[PDB]
Design a protein around this ligand. Structure first.
Ligand SMILES: Cc1ncc(C[n+]2csc(CCOP(=O)(O)OP(=O)(O)O)c2C)c(N)n1
Ligand SMILES: Cc1ncc(C[n+]2csc(CCOP(=O)(O)OP(=O)(O)O)c2C)c(N)n1
Ligand SMILES: Cc1ncc(C[n+]2csc(CCOP(=O)(O)OP(=O)(O)O)c2C)c(N)n1
Ligand SMILES: [Mg+2]
Ligand SMILES: [Mg+2]
Ligand SMILES: [Mg+2]
Lengths: 554, 554, 554
């Protein structure tokens, strides 16, 4: 006897999901039962719904998509924070909420977990604001069409979507889903437009002296990584990254020239791109953070703006094809233009070295983490100064970096890494998280313990919101210190294999990392103590400009 | 010097539009100027915005898509009625509104044509409710992406979309649009799913004794007319239509068996479909009107439900392909199953004949209009008793019928026929419209005069809302009578070539139609006077069941 | 046996309504039946829902509030245009929509008059955008609370509100409404705040040399007319009006000094207010039209901004009392400050006179209408050049002017006058309407005929959108001319007592007005033919500034 909930489960499996995340509530228990009957995936549990959503977000990063299941209102609303995050970071997370019994609809009944009015369509209205698709299932017959619609839309658009299922309907008989090639289907490509866009770009490139490539944070969502480095091989030119695109290109590569981020770029790089004859700008996200208060925002006649969906070049916009198809086709026809690469040096990064027994230093933490990175590593870098020393690392080919520079929700780090680890258990997972950020979502380290995930967490204890102290200080930047290392035993409670360690000197950190690598059955939190004054120059420079731009009066 | 408004114009032309409809207002004048610079289409004008929207709707029916341009709030809101209509009737109308100067945004300025508050995002929020896409253009740089998004989404989904352009931005420099194959692009078809759906349907058909085809009102939007009659040729079986699908299948055809509409079906037809071994139900819209108060709604194991997007057959749903591709593929493999056709008669319709000089009769009007219909005719039938004698006509192969049975906005008839005529000037356009409906939108007959469109309008003057009088009578059903024939000279005003005639007897109607056919440079309104008591039995039967179902207490 | 619909009816009667306006549809028929059972009011019918809404709006102007009843979506959406209008013009219109059977809710049924999806909460979401309160009645038990909430909120806020009643629920048993003092209840007045505001204003006035009063278009909604002229009697100072406040002060008065409207003010008046020591600015609406493109917008330390709700004077805002209470209290304590009045002349208006047999002239039309005005007259002036010669009339004490300068929906004129006449049948009703505007809503003159309302309509036929031709001309300004006078017989159809006359010379107009005054049982339309070139200088001046401001690039 095949139910609506089973239909949902089988479709999620067809997406390529092996896990979904959940927090139980009476509105979703039966739905959770239906999902559990599918042995092709595991149902894993979170502390709260905010973390649950961000766990799904992290999973989407490594798997391609994700699903989280919550209860009505009290669960769903906080998960909408994570949904908005998924939208901001171009990740197809599917949020499924339990919903009131369909027989309660239009009766004037007031229900628990509602704001106390006779109707309760407010949740769906809120969800629409942060999703590409949002449906409320209230009968078994229309359920398949709705489920299929949200999933297919989410995957095609690389955006999150929302689902309601009335609690009494999860159990209802339902037709079975058919076999599929894939649940992802892009629109059929417009060949007239593709040809014209490639021709126009080739023409501009041919008459150029020194083209540069600038890579943006939508490159992965556009599924355009391989196509990009193929194009880079053909062009021979300099390849640069925007901050949020770290790890989207192999730094091993002959053409890699480093970070473009306005005045905090690697030396020479600002001049490289700002002055380019033909800037091949691929999948960028230009906002107030990435353009450094609108001071570093390349546009106009010399820019080839190549977005996931469309290409703008030489005063014309060409639409109706995928970025991936454009980059593949362009690589066939593009000329060799090496001038940019041969006129510039491979990026290097100066890190000040200390002695063994000196107090631990920001630069010294970066030096130690850099040495940890392998081709099999995923580095998660939290909002705060961790953004900036993420930029300062030389990452080996194959290594992955995860940033959340568009949403920028502090605390994202922890549950995100948890989900990400679930979705790629074969990789080494490393987290950089500030003390302030950790406090928002700390409890999710307990899930890492529960599920025996060997994540290495570098907790940067500098005693407050330093990214804010350096830029605009006030009493609001100072938080209650915790014994972060001591928190691991609390989550262990005599069961788990989590480790909590203090690093107070470079010697003490070197020992802590050795212990961490040996801890195969649980997370390792290393509380790194550095002085509040000891942040990157990069942060100070970037912050001053951004803050004065956000405070602008005219 | 190429502007945002010119970009919009060139994209509309690429859709295949040769006309757009407009009402001027200060928020859209510059935009209208930009559109006028494109000689590939004509800008035509309407009396009011409700009519403007319905004109676009009518144009979409004959052309494939349409566009209407209105001013902020005072224009846009009433056009949203038509937009909802377009959504209901699966037509990609694009509504473009003029909007306040972008420099007024966030200033706290109160603007004219707004509700008087400091912000005015209320319009876009309302538009989202009735569209598949809705964007507000407030800068030139993001304008192309937004324009392209609404147009492409509208065409793919066969749903209307909405656009804002800030009045100061219509003039702004803009990149040019690239060449395209087509602005329509469906998602790439899932071949695993298609194969399994066709295989499952063929298996069910093979073991069937008498399959029937039932055609619904989404058949045209799914662009599935030719594929349907190809399938009908292969299957040899009985082909029946739902009310709203009149004209979607040639009544000339050997397999045509008439109307399925519950208890108001053609004799034998209800038994034919209700009792079928395997009901091939194609692109249906099952609502309270079409299912006749939920009494005639075929579903369950014996039904092959083939929707624009998906197919449900034998307890499985198959998604990820177009209806058209499904129907083409099914026609290759389907067996011959003629039992349904050879066990039933070609539908006939009994019409009572009167004498020349007797007072005009409902049946006699149908008889006269039926004789007018050619393969080159488009018949527009208004909500009211005109729905019912539209059903009662035998239409020659090629003839088109236009119904609005999902939205059902009285008055739609007139502006809709106007737009439809604009979009197919080579065809003969015939309108059936009640006296009550005509009063809502009458003024648009003046546009037909202005643009010299030879539409023949049969105004059925029965002195009120008869469809309502017959079912649930009250003082609200009785309206002020007009001299409808005399109204033509009013719109002529010594310029135009409109004709207004009274038909009071069958002889008098026969003469009026002769005059109408001869009137090549303007519309002809024939005020047909029939008694209030003289409506179809079909209406009474249908009405009683529907009304008692809508008044149901449990 | 007492029903939900009867409850609604009795509450409407308690508002002081004697009429409600309706268009029948199956979703509201039973509701209409319930309302008809209340003999304390009359149910009157409209051609379409846009006109229906604007009829209610007009009724609210003379009665204080109004109600319109429409059917779901197809009716309600276009009525939302009128609702937005009511919000803009501060009038408590209650729109009541019929809605689907409550048993259809949450079933996945598709219903007629919907966009075709399984749910249909889109209407309520749209209504919220343009109302102060919006409720959907879906059970009998919560119906009283909801009805009482929308009505009370509407009246308190002077804003429109929205109601849904499920069609099956109009008939349901319901408790009866209790007796009331009034359905209007403002919040209890804050006496600390009132005292401080009056004290601060008196202090500023006392040390002033020449205070001026400037009256705005919210004066009537604030129910502050009598209080204003009491204050003017005490202050002895100059009293000036904003355009939209015409008729809110007796021009008979010793202190009346005319129109303040930037550069189109009466001579000297701009200097009077712009230069005032202490500008008592009462219930103003400052928008781009009233401030003449932001060039005439008095603010800062010298301005006493007295709004319906709050007073800002000398760098402090005082809230928590009604404008009426503030003005009453201020009149007790205010000093005499006559300087502004004795330094300026009573406003006069130069009108050029022609001969009897010369072609009719704009100035000559104004001269004739001015002579018609009595203390018992209500003048309705449409958007267009009619705004401007409304300003140019000297109105006798007691005379009423109706303007719609915030919404500015052309066509408003006609249905608004109809409703207004219904709500004050004892008064003489005069309409000024342009030819372009008349075309949008013309059919509602048929209702005036039906209900035997002796409205005198001056149709200004200047052959297009002249207000637009003078400012920014293009093909979109030119419309199909009608025989406007001939349209009356069409609506009469041998029944009614409407008159249609042409005025082509001043003699011919003088005769037409004589006929109009004698026509006691129907409307009289006088088609006044003037040249397209013959608009007010006032319009040209005002238009040029406003248009260049709306087209501003920075
Ligand atoms: C949910 C949320 N609240 C507030 C902020 C604003 N915010 C941005 S950074 C930041 C400080 C983070 O401090 P920490 O984790 O200690 O990193 P550090 O600056 O010390 O390196 C805050 C509070 C945010 N990004 N997200
Ligand atoms: C905008 C709108 N308002 C009201 C209705 C409700 N309605 C449906 S049929 C109908 C009667 C129209 O009668 P008429 O055009 O004279 O046709 P008849 O059946 O009398 O021949 C009405 C008022 C509607 N469908 N749409
Ligand atoms: C519903 C609506 N549609 C469009 C407009 C834009 N508009 C403002 S004035 C105007 C012209 C009015 O023409 P008419 O009534 O003849 O005035 P006149 O010739 O005296 O200038 C138009 C179309 C509007 N204000 N409201
Ligand atoms: Mg910190
Ligand atoms: Mg009728
Ligand atoms: Mg005019």
């Amino acid at each position: 006897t095949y139910t609506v909930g089973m239909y949902l489960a089988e479709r999620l499996v067809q997406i390529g999901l092996k896990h979904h995340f959940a927090v139980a509530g009476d509105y979703n228990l039966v739905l959770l039962d239906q999902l559990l009957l599918n042995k092709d995936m595991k149902q894993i549990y979170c502390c709260n719904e905010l973390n649950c959503g961000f766990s799904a977000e992290g999973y989407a990063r490594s798997n391609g998509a994700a699903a989280a299941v919550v209860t009505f209102s009290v669960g769903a609303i906080s998960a909408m924070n994570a949904l908005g995050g998924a939208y901001a970071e171009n990740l197809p997370v599917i949020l499924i909420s339990g919903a009131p019994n369909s027989n309660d609809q239009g009766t004037g009944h007031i229900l628990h977990h509602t704001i106390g009015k006779t109707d309760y369509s407010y949740q769906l209205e809120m969800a629409r604001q942060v999703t590409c698709a949002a449906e409320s299932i209230t009968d078994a017959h229309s359920a398949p069409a709705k489920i299929d619609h949200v999933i297919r839309t989410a995957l095609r658009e690389r955006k999150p979507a929302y689902l309601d299922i009335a609690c009494n309907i999860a159990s209802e008989p339902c037709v079975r889903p058919g076999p599929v090639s894939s649940l992802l289907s892009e629109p059929e490509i417009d060949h007239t437009s593709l040809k014209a866009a490639v021709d126009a770009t080739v023409a501009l490139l041919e008459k150029s002296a020194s083209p540069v490539m600038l890579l943006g944070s939508k490159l992965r969502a556009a599924n355009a990584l391989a196509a990009t480095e193929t194009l880079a091989d053909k062009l021979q030119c300099a390849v640069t990254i925007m901050a949020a695109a770290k790890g989207f290109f192999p730094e091993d590569h002959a053409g890699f020239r480093g970070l473009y981020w306005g005045e905090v770029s690697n030396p020479g790089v600002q001049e490289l791109v700002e002055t380019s004859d033909a800037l091949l700008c691929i999948a960028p996200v230009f906002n107030d953070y990435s353009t450094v208060g609108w001071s570093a925002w390349p546009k106009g006649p010399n820019v080839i703006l190549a977005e996931p969906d469309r290409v703008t070049v030489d005063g014309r916009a060409y639409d109706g094809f995928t970025l991936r198809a454009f980059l593949q086709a362009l690589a066939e026809k593009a000329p060799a233009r090496p001038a940019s690469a041969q006129k510039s040096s491979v990026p290097t990064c100066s890190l000040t070295a200390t002695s063994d027994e000196a107090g631990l230093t920001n630069d010294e933490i970066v030096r130690h983490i850099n040495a940890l990175l392998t081709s099999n590593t995923t580095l998660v870098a939290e909002t705060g100064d961790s953004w900036f020393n993420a930029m300062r690392m030389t990452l080996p080919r194959g290594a992955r970096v995860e940033l959340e520079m568009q949403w920028g929700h502090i605390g994202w780090s922890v549950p995100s890494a948890f989900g990400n680890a679930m979705g790629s258990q074969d990789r080494q997972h490393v987290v950089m998280v500030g003390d302030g950020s950790f406090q928002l979502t700390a409890q999710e380290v307990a899930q890492m313990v529960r599920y025996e995930l060997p994540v290495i967490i570098f907790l940067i204890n500098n005693r407050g919101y330093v990214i804010e102290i350096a830029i605009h200080d006030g009493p609001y930047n100072y938080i209650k210190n915790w014994d972060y290392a001591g928190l691991m035993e609390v989550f262990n409670a005599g069961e788990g294999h989590g480790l909590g360690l203090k690093a107070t000197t470079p010697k003490e950190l070197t020992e802590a990392i050795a212990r961490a690598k040996a801890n195969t059955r649980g997370p390792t939190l290393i509380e790194c103590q550095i002085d509040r004054t000891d942040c990157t120059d990069m942060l100070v420079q970037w912050g001053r400009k951004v803050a004065s731009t956000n405070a602008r009066k005219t």
